[PDB]
């Protein structure tokens, strides 16, 4: 059930006395004339902070519970209006709807409305007033306690008839402090254009006139992104489809540059035997950039070819092309046993940077003789025809892999559909802004991309995918001004949105902006 809150729920924001002065403040307050939720109990959200009230004549409401769990999984604030005194605790309680321990803090202290605010470190305010369904009458709540406890409060309950709840919005208030230091009246500046006017003037009386109060600005309704069409894909499409894929004893490479590096196609690659990216993760690498990809390939028996990493130490990679620790980059692999293998399997090619381990087919490894030029028994060449069996799967059989470390090897720039005639954010290439993009007559030369104004600011764009010129207007904004008779005469007001078109917000389009609430007249005075 719901009911209008009227003006109830103002409280002394801070601990200071003020004379008969109008004080402006920012705090968590019950917005004027908002809905209280009325109850006649369930656990509820605390949200930002809670106004609460009831008319329980026989002190029927006995207390409250607050926390995240309201159960022994963590601590919870308990409050009870016991018959002798107020009692407060913070134990890790465990109870049902109402009871009828790590207790790190404790404290003790229908004719009527009993009325409170709970806030958060935690604080309470109250008032207790006679009543005749909330009164239309105004009275602020005095502070009642502040507790050092700092409990995580997100929900609350009630312990025990009619009672009310409402949520403290962040709000700007003007408060009428008075001769005894008391608050006698209040405004809620956000309520209506007259309440903005009262707050702007710092006054409860407002004279006949037109007053500025705020800036109206149309917000951008979405973000549009545009780039030229993708073209000139990376040579990866040939590399990972090469039946002639390089032997690790004779590894080979090329600079992928001036290309669309479509690494997203590898990121999603359900057929890939592996991916080995020691640099950027492939989801980011699909949008990476570098001067070129250092793209290079090798193949061996799968379990030995698994040694191929930057800063790795495996003997097979030492015997082929083992990368330095500075070789962080992208990598990918394929099942060579299914196609790259010969009749002898991995014997199709010389087994495990390109030739960077001083690797060649001559004498290499073994200190058994002075390395006289026989590639066998004198001083073994390690990278002979690979040992992986043709009948095995590509871990026991042969496997092939390639990799590339990082101004011209560029990932694809995705673009949105275009939008027209709406205030939106726009990105076109490196140009960013916020505006109403509109189709236009303004022709300009084939190499050119932008408009300009005389003030050297962006004024138009060529769309990079259908070469029309879009004239750009900023998102409409202007002053808000409140026309008013004196409050002494009426509370009725009319709003002028300066220089706006009434489409953009009775209503009247004046020559100075859109006027609201005022009636047009053909007489003159």
């Amino acid at each position: 059930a719901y009911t209008n809150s009227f003006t109830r729920g103002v409280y002394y924001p801070d601990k200071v006395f003020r004379s008969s002065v109008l004080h402006s403040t920012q705090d968590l307050f019950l917005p004027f004339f908002s809905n209280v939720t009325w109850f006649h109990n369930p656990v509820l959200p605390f949200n930002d902070g809670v106004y609460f009230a009831s008319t329980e004549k026989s002190n029927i409401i006995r207390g409250w519970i607050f926390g995240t769990t309201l159960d022994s999984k963590t601590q919870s604030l308990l409050i009870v209006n016991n018959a002798t005194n107020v009692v407060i605790k913070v134990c890790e309680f465990q109870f049902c709807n109402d009871p009828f321990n790590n207790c790190t803090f404790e404290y003790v202290s229908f004719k009527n409305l009993r009325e409170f605010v709970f806030k958060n470190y935690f604080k309470i305010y109250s008032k207790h007033t006679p009543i005749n369904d909330l009164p239309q009458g105004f009275s602020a709540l005095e502070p009642l306690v502040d507790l050092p406890i700092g409990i995580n409060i997100t929900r609350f309950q009630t312990l025990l008839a009619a009672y009310y709840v409402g949520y403290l919005q962040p709000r700007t208030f003007l408060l009428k402090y008075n001769e005894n230091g008391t608050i006698t009246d209040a405004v809620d500046c956000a309520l209506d254009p007259l309440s903005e006017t009262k707050c702007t003037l710092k006054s409860f009386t407002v004279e006949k006139g037109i007053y500025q109060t705020s800036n109206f600005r149309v917000q951008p309704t979405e973000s549009i992104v545009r780039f030229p069409n993708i073209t000139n894909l990376c040579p990866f499409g040939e590399v990972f489809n090469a039946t002639r894929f390089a032997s690790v004893y004779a590894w080979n490479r090329k600079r992928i540059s001036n290309c669309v590096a479509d690494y997203s196609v590898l990121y999603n690659s359900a057929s890939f035997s592996t991916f080995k990216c020691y640099g950027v993760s492939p989801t980011k690498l699909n949008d990476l950039c570098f001067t070129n990809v250092y793209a290079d390939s090798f193949v061996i028996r799968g379990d030995e070819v698994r040694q191929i990493a930057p800063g790795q130490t495996g003997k097979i990679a030492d015997y082929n092309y083992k990368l330095p620790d500075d070789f962080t980059g992208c990598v990918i692999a394929w099942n060579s046993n299914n196609l790259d293998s010969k009749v002898g399997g991995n014997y199709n090619y010389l087994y495990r940077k390109p030739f960077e381990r001083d690797i060649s087919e001559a004498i290499y490894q073994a200190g058994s003789t002075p390395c006289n030029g026989v590639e066998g028994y004198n001083c073994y060449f390690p990278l002979q025809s690979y040992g992986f069996q043709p009948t095995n799967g590509v871990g026991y059989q042969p496997y092939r892999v390639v990799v590339l470390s990082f101004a011209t090897v560029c990932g694809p720039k995705k673009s949105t559909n275009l939008v027209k005639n709406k205030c939106v954010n726009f990105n076109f290439n490196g140009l960013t802004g916020t505006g109403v993009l509109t189709e236009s007559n303004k022709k300009f030369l084939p190499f050119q991309q932008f408009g300009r104004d005389i003030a050297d600011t962006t004024d138009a764009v060529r769309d990079p995918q259908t070469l029309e010129i879009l004239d750009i207007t900023p998102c409409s904004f202007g002053g808000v001004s409140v026309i008013t008779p004196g409050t002494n005469t009426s509370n009725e007001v009319a709003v002028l949105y300066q220089d706006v078109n009434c489409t953009e917000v009775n209503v009247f389009q004046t020559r100075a902006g859109c006027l609201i609430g005022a009636e047009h007249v053909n007489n003159s005075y």
Partner: antibody
Amino acid sequence: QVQLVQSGAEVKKPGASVQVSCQASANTFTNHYIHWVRQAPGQGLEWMGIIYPTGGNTIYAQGFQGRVTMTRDTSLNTIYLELSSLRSEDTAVYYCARDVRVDDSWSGYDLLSGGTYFDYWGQGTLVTVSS
Amino acid sequence: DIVMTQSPDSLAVSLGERATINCRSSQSVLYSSNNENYLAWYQQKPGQPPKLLIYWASTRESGIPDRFSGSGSGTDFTLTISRLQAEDVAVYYCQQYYSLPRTFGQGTKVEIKR
């Protein structure tokens, strides 16, 4: 440790079809090459194949390359299971084996590492020889 | 290929004595980059999918079989049986972190002599 489980237990026939299911979570779903682990009830189970369960990137043991199939489902907290032309051991129970995660800062499908050795197992969903 | 396979299929240990369940690969498991021993022992109930409990050929899981647990040795490995002939008498085999075709042996049994 892992959310390992097995499901869909039924009769399946040699040379004919079979069906199954398994449960997955955390690094065994998206950070390791999990094993499909199965055997005839006379022994502890072994790898029918190795699966990277996000996107499913797959390799099989050559006795079960045709006879058994597995599918990606890691975001569904799962792995899908099937068979066709089933082995003579068609009564073999099976479950997911929760592979140990990628041990270094490489990125993409980790099948370049590990084997059917795993930090958890789905206890084995039963089977019977439908022939 | 790796050939991860078990040796005894069953034990017959004396009560209060010890024995080992044994297993091996064919070659190179202390792999050349680090000698980082790419094997571990699965132990579980008979007929189950494999789970590791003697981890990384030199370590053990949280609440692992301990007196029934064990370690690698070159191409070979063992799980122990010190007073473990009953209750800790699991089905056990070594398995490889070594490769894609690598998998557990057929769950050879720790058990008491009869």
